[PDB]
Amino acid sequence: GNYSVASNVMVPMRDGVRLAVDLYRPDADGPVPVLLVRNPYDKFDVFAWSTQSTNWLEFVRDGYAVVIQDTRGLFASEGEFVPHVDDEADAEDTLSWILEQAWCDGNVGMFGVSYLGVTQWQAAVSGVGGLKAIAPSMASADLYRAPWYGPGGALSVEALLGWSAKIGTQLITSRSDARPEDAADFVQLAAILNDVAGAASVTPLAEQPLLGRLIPWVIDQVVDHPDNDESWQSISLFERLGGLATPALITAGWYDGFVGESLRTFVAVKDNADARLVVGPWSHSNLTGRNADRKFGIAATYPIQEATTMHKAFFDRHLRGETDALAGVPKVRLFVMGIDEWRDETDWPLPDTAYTPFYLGGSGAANTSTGGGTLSTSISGTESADTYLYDPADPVPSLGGTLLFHNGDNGPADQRPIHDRDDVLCYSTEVLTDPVEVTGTVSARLFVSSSAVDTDFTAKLVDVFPDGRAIALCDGIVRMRYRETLVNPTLIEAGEIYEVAIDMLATSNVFLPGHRIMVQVSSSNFPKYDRNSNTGGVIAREQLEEMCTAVNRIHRGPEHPSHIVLPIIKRK
Amino acid sequence: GNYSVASNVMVPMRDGVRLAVDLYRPDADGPVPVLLVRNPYDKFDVFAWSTQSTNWLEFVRDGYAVVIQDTRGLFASEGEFVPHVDDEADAEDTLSWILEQAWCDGNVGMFGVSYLGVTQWQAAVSGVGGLKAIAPSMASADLYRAPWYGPGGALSVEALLGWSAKIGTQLITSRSDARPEDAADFVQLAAILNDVAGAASVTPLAEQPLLGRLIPWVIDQVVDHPDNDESWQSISLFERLGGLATPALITAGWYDGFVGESLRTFVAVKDNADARLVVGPWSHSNLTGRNADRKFGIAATYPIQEATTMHKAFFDRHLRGETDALAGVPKVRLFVMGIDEWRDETDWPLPDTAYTPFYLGGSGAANTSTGGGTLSTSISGTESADTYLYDPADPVPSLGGTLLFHNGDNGPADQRPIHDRDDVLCYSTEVLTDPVEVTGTVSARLFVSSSAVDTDFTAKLVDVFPDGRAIALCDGIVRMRYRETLVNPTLIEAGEIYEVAIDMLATSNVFLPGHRIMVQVSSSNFPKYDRNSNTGGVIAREQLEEMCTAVNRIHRGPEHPSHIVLPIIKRK
Ligand SMILES: *C1(O)O[C@H](CS)[C@@H](CS)O1
Ligand SMILES: *C1(O)O[C@H](CS)[C@@H](CS)O1
Ligand SMILES: [Cl-]
Ligand SMILES: [Cl-]
Ligand SMILES: [Cl-]
Ligand SMILES: [Cl-]
Ligand SMILES: [Cl-]
Ligand SMILES: [Cl-]
Structure with missing residues (x-):
């Protein structure tokens, strides 16, 4: 139950540069298992990040050592700081040093959030046998x-x-x-x-x-x-993850910037080792469960003591060889919005997922929330098109979603402030008489054309409440030059029709009786994403006056069946 | 820079009951100064409260010992828990034990927030000479x-x-x-x-x-x-505070439940010892500076590292005898809203405060925000009265202010949702051409009458923005039976006119050009305060059907000059 703390122990890297660490070591007669955290925000400042992670002093009281490190070029460490580029080699050298110490028993793990999570994937690809488990929260491998x-x-x-x-x-x-x-x-x-x-x-x-x-x-x-x-x-x-066999405890949030990439990492490692998944309704800087126009209940608040219990069971199994330590713990645990309840699952994606097209339709123009746009599981009967002007000087403002630093504390935001814009196209179902659950990855397939040689298209899924609130769920974008590949872009021909895919990340929501399912389509979402210049040029080097307006069109009907693909779950 | 931690050390009280403590002790050849924290929310759970206080591990790295205690009857401590009643004696016995230890040099202090602040005043009245300084944040002595x-x-x-x-x-x-x-x-x-x-x-x-x-x-x-x-x-x-000579570093927030009582403690101790004051725009559970309809800027976020620096300088002066440790530190530091800037002062209340009456007036009825109610520095010319029905089954809902647990994260709330109610009386100035600063304690004097033998009256100060937002600042209530004393209540006579005072706590705000100063008057504010039954009975024992409606009246004119008293500051 007792421990000691040693400050500013200097660890040499392969090039002679030394990085600073703090050592939290339990009172013990011999060697112990060890956990490592790599931090660019001052190792001394533990209160800044820990409330988004675990009550990790419990680990120390229970007989684990903990090492916290300043990354290269920051605070007490030597060298020069550049994001990402030194972290693979520096992690390899740090793990090796730990394994050589008198107080380490040969078993090492990692935990932490955001940059403290990215650095765990960078450590995992090193091939160091002594690394037995990782736990990356709200992070990415690409x-x-x-x-x-x-x-x-x-x-x-x-x-x-x-x-x-x-x-x-x-x-x-x-x-x-x-x-x-x-x-x-x-x-x-x-x-x-x-x-x-x-x-x-x-x-x-x-x-x-x-x-x-x-x-x-x-x-x-x-x-x-x-x-x-x-x-x-x-x-x-990412491409190296398939060849690993390292257990990983992965955490994500439905309104977090990293959500798509966090989920992908689970799918990449689940077949070769013990993977676990936890997803709550959080954004990167708001873990409370409370937002301006939407409250999820006290159960939604980041459950730090339950997280601490789960992490300790995970490390007991993989670092201490306790075979029954994870008895009763589910593989996957999700906060299902709408019903606003936690629920256990056996896999992600869910087993019985029905990937179902909902087609764009309606009489008249779909411009604005008072237009005639519809959504239906039946293919539309008449060939039609909706048209708008996109002007880079007046983009559609970002409201909620996966924002990080600009108003990043209101994920489930009310969309009504932008519903009267002519460049916001709206399509809705009739009012629902029975519940519909949407849990999984989400995407759209659209038939589109433009007056320009490059432009953007956006899509956003929305839950309409009885009182009028139009609450954001998930969204995505496609930049037309990258429609087929992110590596080797090509321009488009003005006036020609293209079929394109939009990756809309993921969600978990039950649309309850009295609600509607709604989709918004446009050509901007600023400053979540930068604005397209509509020229085909090098976008970041252009003056606002060098940019052009574009006349953009969405095609819908029997020969151009534009649709959203929803991951439908039915549980009786 | 190095230290050790010992868990669950058991300390005997005068009655034989033992309380549990954790000891954070620096590597040192001899005895050191000591800081004590008394906590009812688990001494182990340091991340739960510390983000609202200080980066206190810095104190330990710099050569202070820190002791954290479970209060009586909770977690690792023996005995039985009842709020408040055992904390004077238990603090006295704990301070005595600390002073008797081999590692204590004879100098002890305290720090912490909320219940961890109340317990510091309970310790200070003990007469233990070894207690040299305290630092109570968001707390009360009554x-x-x-x-x-x-x-x-x-x-x-x-x-x-x-x-x-x-x-x-x-x-x-x-x-x-x-x-x-x-x-x-x-x-x-x-x-x-x-x-x-x-x-x-x-x-x-x-x-x-x-x-x-x-x-x-x-x-x-x-x-x-x-x-x-x-x-x-x-x-x-409170009444014992005047006889003390103990330095105190006091923190408060403009939207915090404790604001009135925190400020009173500063006034009570400033003449006999070194007192310091810090006030930000926070509520008890929201220290971010961000709210649904009002943002104060990144400078408003609780400044934890600056707070840590100030606390260490304060303890260096009073526990270590370093005479110049507080050089350049102001006596008082306030976040002034409107201009949204931190500013240094020499005293609280401010030296040049002009306590100025603003009189209630206007043509026609003042019911609702579209009525004719006015505010002016000139006494009104015509005798008039505004009348409304207060029904306990339909009280005015609480919106922002000093709420703690019911929607307590939106202090500066927009008041427009309640402006159409007939029981909400509104009085406003004309649109301002020059800025007006209001910084200090706030109160109202009203001439009132009722059809009932008891009722309530409320008053709320508001800043009206150019776009229409009506932002809450400070508020109070008077329960009529307690109009003259909180100790020995008496009932009122139906139809008779009484002059009453309403204590509206305190604020700091510059009303900028283009804004208005506004006051709202009513008879309820639920559930911030419980609802009056209008019967003269024992309120908490009555059924809703046992309660009565009341016809209430506000009188205004030359012979009944109802007014708000504003603390005006002029700085050229
Ligand atoms: C985490 O610490 O916050 C950042 C949000 S952009 C991220 C950078 S990789 O890591
Ligand atoms: C603090 O810890 O929160 C409470 C708000 S009512 C208060 C009780 S004295 O102490
Ligand atoms: Cl809600
Ligand atoms: Cl639940
Ligand atoms: Cl149709
Ligand atoms: Cl604002
Ligand atoms: Cl400032
Ligand atoms: Cl008048």
């Missing part, structure tokens, strides 16, 4: 796909500018000797964080005098590489 | 005045039922051997926490089968004692 770009090939601009300002702020506050420019730089960084959409609105997007000076990576890597090219593929771990 | 009743003599019913359910929940989860009834009790407690207004609506209020069984104190002490009688005066510390 950095292009989340959080910097996405499956549709658009830049996640609010995520990039917000995070870069956060990193810049801590660099100034952590300086040994203050610089003359520090005071003014601090003020400017606060202005970005108070107004992320404003920061994202300046053209050309690639000209960032403050952020480019403090963290050159923001332009040199992220903005300058819009294709999923060799620079991205190098830091990706 | 438990009737906050959080259970108030300066107006109404029960804070949502605070009582919510907290009692929280305490009940942790008792079940902490049991050694589970009871057959535990599973069902847990479900019922969750239902209260998901619907606090619903729980508060059941009549008679005093019949609480679940909460009365788990924690008898809820009825035996709180509900059964509506007068500020001998049972309350016994646990009060």
Whole structure:
């Protein structure tokens, strides 16, 4: 039950650069199992991240050692900081050092959230036999796909500018000797964080005098590489995951920026080792279960003590060889929205999933929420088309969804403020008499045309309540040059009809009696994603005046059966 | 920089009952200064409260010892738990034990929030010379005045039922051997926490089968004692504060349940010792600076590292005798709303405060926001009166303000949802051409009459924005039987006019050009306060059908000059 703490122990890497760690070690007569956490936000500052993870001092009281490390070039560590590029090698060297110590029994694991989760996948590909289990929460194994770009090939601009300002702020506050420019730089960084959409609105997007000076990576890597090219593929771990046999405890949230990539990692590792999955209704910075126009109940609040119990059982099985430690623990545990209840499952995707088309239709134009747009399981009878103007100077504002830094605390947001826009097309079912459950991955297939040689298309799933609230669920985008591949883009021909897919991530929701199922279609969602210039040019290098408007069209009928694909679950 | 942790050290009280503590002790050759925290929410669970306080492991790395204690009858401690009644004696005995240890140098201090703050005032009155400084955040020295009743003599019913359910929940989860009834009790407690207004609506209020069984104190002490009688005066510390000479670092929030009582403690101790004050725009459970319809900026987020630096300087001065440790630190630091900026001051109340009457007036009736009610620095010219019906079956709903457990995360709430009610009287200034600052304590003087022998009157200060948002600032209530004293109540005569005072707590706000100053007057605010029955009976023992409606009247003019008193600050 007792322990000691040693601060700033210096660990040498292969190139001679030393990284700083803190050691939390139990009172014990011999060696013990060990857990590692790799952190870019100061190893000393434990209260900043721990409330989004576990009550991990319980692990120490129960006989585990815990090691917390400052990553390269930050706080007490030597070297120079660049995101992602040094973390594979630095993790390998750190695991090796731990295994060589007098107090380590040969069994090592990892846990943590966000960047503290990404670094676990980077450690897992090293081939170090002593690493017996990992637990990555709200994370990704492919950095292009989340959080910097996405499956549709658009830049996640609010995520990039917000995070870069956060990193810049801590660099100034952590300086040994203050610089003359520090005071003014601090003020400017606060202005970005108070107004992320404003920061994202300046053209050309690639000209960032403050952020480019403090963290050159923001332009040199992220903005300058819009294709999923060799620079991205190098830091990706995903294709290596299939060859591993390492147990993983994976956590995600329905309104979290990482949700699509978190779920993919579970599917990639489940066949070769013991994988577990937990998904709640959270966004990256709001784990409370409470939002402005939607409350999920006290059961929805991040369950930190239950999480601590589950993590300890998982590590007891895989690090301590206790064969019955996970008795009674489910493989998959989901918070099902609508009914607003936790429920156990045997697999993800769910076994009895019926992937069902809901077709776009209706009399007259589908523009605005008072138009005639419908959704039905029957193919539409008349050939029709809905048309709108997309102007880059006036994009559709982002409201909820998977926002990270710009208003990122209201995932299930009411959509009524944007329903009167002519560029927002709406399609709804009739009012439901019986419940319909949608749990799984979601996508759309649309037949589209444009006056331009490049543009974007968006789709958003919505639950309409009896009182009028139109609550967001999941959404996605396709940038037309990347319609067939993220690696080798090509332009389109003006006026020609194309069939395209939109990846809309995932959800779990029961649409209750008295509700409607609704879909919104458009060509922008700003600043969740950057805006298309409609020119075919290098988007981030263009002035707002260099950009063009586009006349865009959605085709629907017997020969052009545009639809959403819903993962339907029926439980009697 | 290094330290050790010893768990479950047992400390004997005067009656032989032992309380459990954890010891965080630095590597040191001899004795050190010591800080104590007294906690009813599990000493092991440090992440639950610490994010609302300080990064206190810095204190340990810098050479302070820290002691965290389970209070009597909870978790690892022996005995039986009853709120407040054992904490004076238990603190005295604990301080004495610390001073007798080999590792203590004779200097002791305290820090912490909420119940961990109340317990510091209970320790301070003990007369133990070794206690050199305290730091109570979001706390009170008079438990009737906050959080259970108030300066107006109404029960804070949502605070009582919510907290009692929280305490009940942790008792079940902490049991050694589970009871057959535990599973069902847990479900019922969750239902209260998901619907606090619903729980508060059941009549008679005093019949609480679940909460009365788990924690008898809820009825035996709180509900059964509506007068500020001998049972309350016994646990009060306030009158003893004037005779102390102990330095205190006091923190408060403008939307916090404890704000009035926190500020009073500063005024009580400032003349005899080194007192300091910090006030931000927070509510008890929302320290982010972000609300549904009002954002204060990133500077408003609870500044935990600056708080840690200030606490360490304060303890260095008073526990380590470092005379220049507080050089450059202000006596008072306030977040001024409107301008939304931190500002330093020399005293509270502010030196140049002009306590200025704003008189109620207008042509026609003041009922609803579209009535004719006005506010002016000039006394009204015509004798008039505004009249309404107050029905206990339909009280005015609580929206923001100082709510604790029922929707307690939206202090600066938009008031428009209640503006069409006939029982909500509205009075406003013209649109402002120059800024007006209101910083200090706030109160109202009203001339009133009723058809009943008892009733309530309420008043609420509001900032009207250019777009229409009507944002709540501070509010209060008077229960008519307690108009002259909280100790010895008397009834009123139907139809007679009385001049009464309403204590509206405190605020700091600049009303900017384009805004208006507004006041709302009514007879209810539920469930922030319980509802008056309008009978003169024992309110908590009455059925809803035993209650009466009341016709209430506000008088205004030259002979009845009803007004609000605003603390005006002018800075050129
Ligand atoms: C986590 O710590 O927050 C960031 C959100 S963009 C992310 C960067 S990989 O890690
Ligand atoms: C703090 O811990 O929260 C409670 C809000 S009513 C309060 C009880 S004295 O202490
Ligand atoms: Cl809701
Ligand atoms: Cl549940
Ligand atoms: Cl049709
Ligand atoms: Cl605002
Ligand atoms: Cl400021
Ligand atoms: Cl008048």
